[PDB]
RNA sequence: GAACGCGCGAUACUCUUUGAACGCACAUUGCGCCCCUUGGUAUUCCAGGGGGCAAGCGU
RNA sequence: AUUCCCACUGUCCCUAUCUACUAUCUAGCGAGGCUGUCUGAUCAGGCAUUGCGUAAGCAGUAGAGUAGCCGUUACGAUCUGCUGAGA
RNA sequence: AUGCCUGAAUAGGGUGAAGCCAGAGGAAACUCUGGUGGAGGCUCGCGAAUUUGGGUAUAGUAGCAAAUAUUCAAAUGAGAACUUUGAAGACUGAAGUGGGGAAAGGUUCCACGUCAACAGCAGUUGGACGUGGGUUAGUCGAUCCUAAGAGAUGGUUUCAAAGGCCUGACAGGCCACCAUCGAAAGGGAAUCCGGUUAAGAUUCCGGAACCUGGAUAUGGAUUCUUCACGGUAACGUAACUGAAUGUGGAGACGUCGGCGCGAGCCCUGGGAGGAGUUAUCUUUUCUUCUUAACAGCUUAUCACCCCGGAAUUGGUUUAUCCGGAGAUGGGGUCUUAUGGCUGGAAGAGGCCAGCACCUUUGCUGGCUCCGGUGCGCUUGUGACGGCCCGUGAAAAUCCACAGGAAGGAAUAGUUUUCAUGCCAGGUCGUACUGUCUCCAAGGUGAACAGCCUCUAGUUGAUAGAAGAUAAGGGAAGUCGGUCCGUAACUUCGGGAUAAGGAUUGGCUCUAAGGGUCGGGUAG
C-alpha cells in the first residue's frame, strides 16, 4: 500500500479508465493539543497498489468529496 | 548479588566519565587527567568522593611544596 | 535461571561425558606408575644431540 | 508464554532456517523465518567493504540502477579510492623508470 | 515377467506404465532437443496434439 | 591394609510393637509442638510415605519495638485473665 | 582399525595462567601487595576409551501380562465400576502425561450404524467392524547446483579426428577440455494477516504484496543538433550506449570469551472493563487493553576524506592498544543492519453491556489508552580480544570493473541499469501418527537440586471383601562389626570557586561580563 499527500494525484487516480470504487473512512481521533477531531482517509487502488490520502481538515475533506466524479462509486466507511 | 566484574565496570565507567567531564570543563588539565586516568584504572580510587578529595589534596600539595623546603630549613 | 543449552546438555550428554572422564582418570592413574610412557620431547632430551652421542660412544 | 516452532519442512537448527517471534494483529505469538543477511561488496585489491555501494543479495542487484552499485570514479564499484590512487602512481612511476632505463641503454650501446 | 486399471487395455469380462527396453536420468511419474500442426489479442508469448532422437608434410 | 584407645549402636543377651507391601477368598478370563509449602490474611485445614496439656475470641494500660507532640493518636510481637481449659 | 563429505552438539559450578594498571623494597634483573584480565593435559556433579543424523570409501490350577485414586448425581442403553455431562479428590509441572517436524507407517484422520471376532474382566467405547467424506501452492519442499565418492565414453581425460561460435558485396579465424549420478539438514527468486470445516490451510475465502520471464507503448533524459553533471576529496544522481578479450565481488565457510544495541518473553505503575473472596481485615487475587508480510520518509558504530602538525607525550577500552607510515582537535562522506513516524489498519482481532426468538436468532452501543525497569531467559547483530589451522567445501546463480569493436539526425536520430502501463507462471508432496530434532511461564528455594502452581493435557493400569522404635549391658554375635544487639560506611547526576541555618560579603594578576544616555559658571 502507498500513501499520497497530493489531492490532485488522488483525483487523477480516480479518473482513470480502470477504476472500481473509492473508500471514504472516518476516524475520530485526538491531536497533540488534546482536542479531538475528524480525520478522513480517501482510498483508491491503482494498477497494483492501494493509494491512501489522509486529511485532518474537515473543510478540505468536504471539498474533495464534492469534487469526486459523480459516476464514481464511493464506500462510506 | 552483583558479581565483581559488573561492579568494577560500572565504577570504572563512572570514574572515566567524571574525569572526562572535569577535563572538558577546564577543572583538570591534560597531564593531571592522564595521571588520574592511569590511577583510576589501577583501583586507586574507590568512588567519586575519593577522586575529588585526591584532586583537591593534590592541588593543595602542589601549592605548598615550593615553600616546603625553606619552611623546613628555617626551623 | 538455567539456560537452555545447560538443560539440553545435562539431559543429553552428561552421562557419557562423566563416564569418559572417569575412564580417562582411571587410565591415567593406572599408567602413572608404569615405566615406558614418555613424551617425544622427553625422549629427544634423553637421546641427546648427535655430538652428545659421539661423546657417549667415546 | 506461548510456544512456537518452525513453519516449514526443515525441523533442525540449521543456518538455512532461523526463527523470530512476532505478535500478529490477532494477538498471538507466531514464528517467522528470517532470510540470510546481505554482505557488503569488498574491494578486489585490499578486501575492505566498498563505500557508497548498496548491500544486497546477489540476485537483488539486477533490479536496481547502476548508480546504486557503482562509484563515478574509475574502477568505481570494483576497487576503493586508495587502491586506484596507488595504481595510478605505480603505473606512472613504472613508465618513467622504463624511459630512464631506455635512455641509459641507448647511452651504453652508443659507445660502439 | 511386473505395476495400475476395465479375459481385456481409456475402443479396457485397439493394446495404459514398464520389462532384452532404446533421447537423458531414475528409489523422482524428473529433465531435454528436433519437425509438422491447432487454439488463445499474436511475427515474438503461452498451451494442446501428432511424429521422432539408444581428413592426411600416405603414394 | 592391620592392630590397640574413647564414644555409639537390636550384632548379641532377647526378643517385642507399629506402618507399608505382600499373601487369601469372591465375579469374569484362563495356561500438643516444630520445619518447608498452599488455601488473599486470622481461624480452620491439605501436602511433604506418622515430614520431624491450657482451645478460638476478647480484655489489660503491664508489654521488644513500629508510628503522633517537645501531659499526650494509633499499630504492637511477647506476658497476664477468662482456662486443669479445649479436644 | 583407520577414514572422508554435509549438518546438530561441544553446556554449567569452582579455581584463577600469560598480558596490563596503581603501589612498596632494590643500582638493574627482579620480588611482594591490591585490582584487572579470562587461559588450560586444572578441578566438580606399547596398552583402554573417546556424542550423534544423512551420505560415502578403504485345572477352573498357576496366574491377571504390573504405568499410582478414585467418589457422588444424572443421561443413553435390554444390560453401566469402565460410555457421556456436571460436581468432588488426585496427577503430569515448560528438562510435561503440552504443541510440532525428518524418517517410517498407509487411511490408523472425520462422520454415521454395530458388538460376530479383537483391544488377556466387561463394554453401549475403539487405531475393531461396515458405509461414506476428506489432503487445493508462481511464493512451503522436491524439481536446479555441486560435496566425499560413484560411474559412461576412448581406468576417469588417457598418443581419441570428442565442439561451439564469429567474419564475409565456400574461404578465413577464435577457444580450449569433457558425459552423467550423488543432499526433502549443504548453496537457493519471490506471501503475509484475519476468517473458515465434522475432518483442509503460509495451499481455500477476503484484503493486502512480492518474484521471474516476455512483448510493447507513453513521459523524461540523451542540452546545437550525436553516449549528462556536481564536490579539493571521501563521494552524490531519476537516467546518462559499450563487442571480442582479461579480471573483481556476493554465493563462500574454524572455535571460544567479555562488552554495546534491537526484538520476543518475564517483572512492574496509573486508568478503562469483566470475574473471585469478604464472620473480621484486605484501595484486594485473576483476566482484556494486540498490530503481519510489504511500502515511503528519516535514523550508524566501523571505515574513509579534508585542514592541521604533536614530548611537559597525549587519546583511550571491562580487556593497553594507537599516533610524523600523521595522534588529540575541527569539519565532512558512506553501508541501512536496527530503531522512530506513516500507509497496510481498525474496517481486523479482543473485552464488555443492552434488545430481538417454540425457528440461521443476529442487531445495536461503548472501551481497546499512557508509562517504567534488567549480572533476568530466548534470539539476532556490531566492534574487538584469545586459541587452533589448508588464508578454514565446491558448484549453479547474480552483479560490477578494465578494454575500446560498433552504432547514432532534418515530416518521429541512438539508448531506454529513470518512471508508468500489459500478460503469464506447468508436474509431484500436503489427511493422521511420529531412530534424529524444534518451542519452553511463575514462586520458593535464598547452594545445580528438590517442592508448588499458571496455560495445556490426564484420571490410563480387571474390580469387591477380609522402614521405624525399644529398659540394662555395649561386639559378650560372627571366621571376620542462614538467624537476635552494635557501630562506621555505602548509589547516580548536576554542580567549579571557603562554608551551607546563618550576620554571606570571600585573594593577586590576567580576553569578554546586555544596549544606550548624561558633566559646571561667565561673556
Ligand atoms: Zn582497496
Amino acid at each position: 500500500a502507498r500513501e499520497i499527500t497530493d489531492i490532485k494525484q488522488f483525483l487523477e487516480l480516480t479518473r482513470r479508465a480502470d477504476v472500481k470504487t473509492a473508500t471514504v473512512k472516518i476516524n475520530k481521533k485526538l491531536n497533540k493539543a488534546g482536542k479531538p477531531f475528524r480525520q478522513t482517509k480517501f482510498k483508491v487502488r491503482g494498477s497494483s497498489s492501494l493509494y491512501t490520502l489522509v486529511i485532518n481538515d474537515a473543510g478540505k475533506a468536504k471539498k474533495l468529496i464534492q469534487s469526486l466524479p459523480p459516476t464514481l462509486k464511493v464506500n462510506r466507511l | 548479588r552483583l558479581p565483581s566484574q559488573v561492579v568494577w565496570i560500572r565504577r570504572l565507567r563512572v570514574l572515566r566519565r567524571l574525569l572526562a567531564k572535569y577535563r572538558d570543563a577546564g577543572k583538570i588539565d591534560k597531564h593531571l587527567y592522564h595521571v588520574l586516568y592511569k590511577e583510576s584504572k589501577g583501583n586507586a580510587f574507590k568512588h567519586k568522593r575519593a577522586l575529588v578529595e585526591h584532586i583537591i589534596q593534590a592541588k593543595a600539595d602542589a601549592q605548598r611544596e615550593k615553600a616546603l623546603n625553606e619552611e623546613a630549613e628555617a626551623r | 535461571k538455567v539456560s537452555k543449552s545447560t538443560k539440553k546438555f545435562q539431559s543429553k550428554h552428561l552421562k557419557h561425558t562423566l563416564d569418559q572422564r572417569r575412564k580417562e582418570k582411571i587410565q591415567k592413574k593406572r599408567i602413572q606408575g608404569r615405566r615406558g610412557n614418555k613424551t617425544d620431547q622427553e625422549k629427544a632430551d634423553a637421546a641427546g644431540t648427535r655430538e652428545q652421542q659421539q661423546l657417549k660412544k667415546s | 508464554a506461548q510456544r512456537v516452532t518452525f513453519r516449514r519442512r526443515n525441523p533442525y537448527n540449521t543456518r538455512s532456517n532461523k526463527i523470530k517471534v512476532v505478535k500478529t494483529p490477532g494477538g498471538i505469538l507466531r514464528a517467522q523465518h528470517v532470510k540470510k543477511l546481505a554482505t557488503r561488496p569488498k574491494c578486489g585489491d585490499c578486501g575492505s567493504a566498498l563505500q557508497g555501494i548498496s548491500t544486497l543479495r546477489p540476485r537483488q542487484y539486477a533490479t536496481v540502477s547502476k548508480t546504486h552499485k557503482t562509484v563515478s570514479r574509475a574502477y568505481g564499484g570494483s576497487r576503493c579510492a586508495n587502491c586506484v590512487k596507488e595504481r595510478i602512481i605505480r603505473a606512472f612511476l613504472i613508465e618513467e623508470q622504463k624511459i630512464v632505463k631506455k635512455v641509459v641503454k641507448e647511452q651504453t650501446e652508443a659507445a660502439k
Side-chain angles (χ1 to χ4, degrees):
Chain A
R2 299 291 179 90
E3 200 203 330
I4 51 177
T5 61
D6 292 331
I7 297 169
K8 309 203 179 197
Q9 184 178 2
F10 182 77
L11 290 180
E12 174 151 48
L13 280 161
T14 68
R15 270 196 287 100
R16 311 186 326 191
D18 179 32
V19 58
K20 298 293 183 182
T21 311
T23 293
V24 175
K25 169 88 178 82
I26 315 299
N27 304 308
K28 298 293 183 182
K29 53 180 50 172
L30 61 83
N31 51 32
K32 298 189 178 177
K35 35 181 174 183
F37 72 99
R38 183 178 181 270
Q39 167 203 73
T40 303
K41 299 209 186 178
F42 300 86
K43 317 190 198 200
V44 65
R45 79 164 303 103
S47 171
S48 52
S49 192
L50 177 71
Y51 307 91
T52 290
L53 177 62
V54 188
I55 297 169
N56 306 272
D57 199 3
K60 191 142 46 192
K62 298 293 183 182
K63 283 206 304 167
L64 188 153
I65 281 171
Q66 293 299 90
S67 179
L68 284 164
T71 68
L72 176 80
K73 315 306 189 53
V74 173
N75 293 125
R76 295 316 200 120
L77 277 296
Chain B
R1 305 301 307 121
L2 199 58
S4 298
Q5 199 173 21
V6 186
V7 190
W8 162 255
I9 285 180
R10 296 156 176 254
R11 200 159 55 95
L12 192 43
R13 277 175 181 163
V14 71
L15 280 180
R16 282 165 183 192
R17 161 161 53 250
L18 182 63
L19 271 173
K21 162 190 202 64
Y22 282 155
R23 190 203 34 198
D24 300 353
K27 321 198 193 82
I28 303 299
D29 50 308
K30 299 167 35 181
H31 322 282
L32 186 50
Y33 171 90
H34 210 70
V35 173
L36 290 178
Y37 188 98
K38 288 300 208 72
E39 274 173 350
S40 71
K41 187 214 200 310
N43 195 40
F45 322 124
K46 278 74 176 176
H47 51 87
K48 160 180 178 186
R49 290 198 322 107
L51 181 52
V52 170
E53 288 165 2
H54 183 278
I55 284 173
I56 62 170
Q57 190 62 23
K59 159 174 196 169
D61 293 5
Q63 186 195 327
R64 184 176 179 179
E65 71 276 16
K66 50 189 296 294
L68 172 68
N69 305 311
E70 297 89 20
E71 183 178 1
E73 292 293 329
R75 275 189 172 268
Chain C
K1 206 187 177 179
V2 193
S3 78
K4 168 207 299 196
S5 195
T6 301
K7 298 178 203 155
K8 289 208 204 145
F9 189 89
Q10 286 177 359
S11 165
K12 275 196 221 154
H13 298 279
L14 198 41
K15 308 284 192 63
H16 79 76
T17 287
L18 289 184
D19 289 359
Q20 184 60 28
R21 201 193 293 164
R22 201 171 307 127
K23 292 204 184 73
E24 283 176 77
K25 165 202 66 187
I26 284 183
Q27 158 87 356
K28 179 180 177 181
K29 183 175 70 62
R30 183 180 63 83
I31 62 170
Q32 258 177 346
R34 297 292 299 274
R35 171 198 65 252
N37 303 280
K38 292 181 181 179
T39 46
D40 305 348
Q41 179 265 344
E42 202 155 337
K43 293 187 286 185
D45 201 355
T49 73
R50 279 174 86 256
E51 293 219 10
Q52 288 193 4
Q53 285 172 192
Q54 293 83 18
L55 281 164
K56 289 158 55 186
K57 174 184 270 185
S58 62
Chain D
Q2 189 213 312
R3 296 167 269 186
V4 308
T5 189
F6 305 120
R7 286 168 77 177
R8 292 170 188 187
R9 197 199 183 79
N10 197 11
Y12 307 105
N13 203 285
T14 304
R15 177 193 35 168
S16 199
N17 66 334
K18 287 283 166 191
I19 298 299
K20 193 167 41 78
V21 178
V22 297
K23 210 191 291 191
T24 79
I28 66 185
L29 292 163
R30 192 172 285 171
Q32 272 184 349
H33 295 253
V34 306
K35 310 193 203 56
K36 308 209 205 185
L37 286 181
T39 310
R40 302 193 49 169
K42 306 295 195 300
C43 172
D45 278 338
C46 62
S48 55
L50 290 175
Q51 176 164 359
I53 286 146
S54 54
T55 300
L56 308 153
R57 291 305 274 162
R59 211 178 253 281
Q60 302 179 8
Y61 286 113
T63 56
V64 295
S65 44
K66 220 196 206 181
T67 77
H68 283 161
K69 65 179 72 66
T70 47
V71 171
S72 283
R73 186 189 46 256
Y75 288 87
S78 195
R79 266 71 168 195
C80 62
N82 302 340
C83 288
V84 168
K85 171 182 156 194
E86 271 188 275
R87 283 164 161 281
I88 298 155
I89 295 181
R90 173 164 266 119
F92 174 75
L93 289 172
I94 284 187
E95 183 178 1
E96 282 320 297
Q97 174 72 16
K98 282 188 53 171
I99 277 175
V100 173
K101 297 296 289 183
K102 190 70 181 83
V103 176
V104 170
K105 185 177 180 180
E106 283 180 352
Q107 285 194 359
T108 187
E109 292 83 4
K112 298 183 180 184

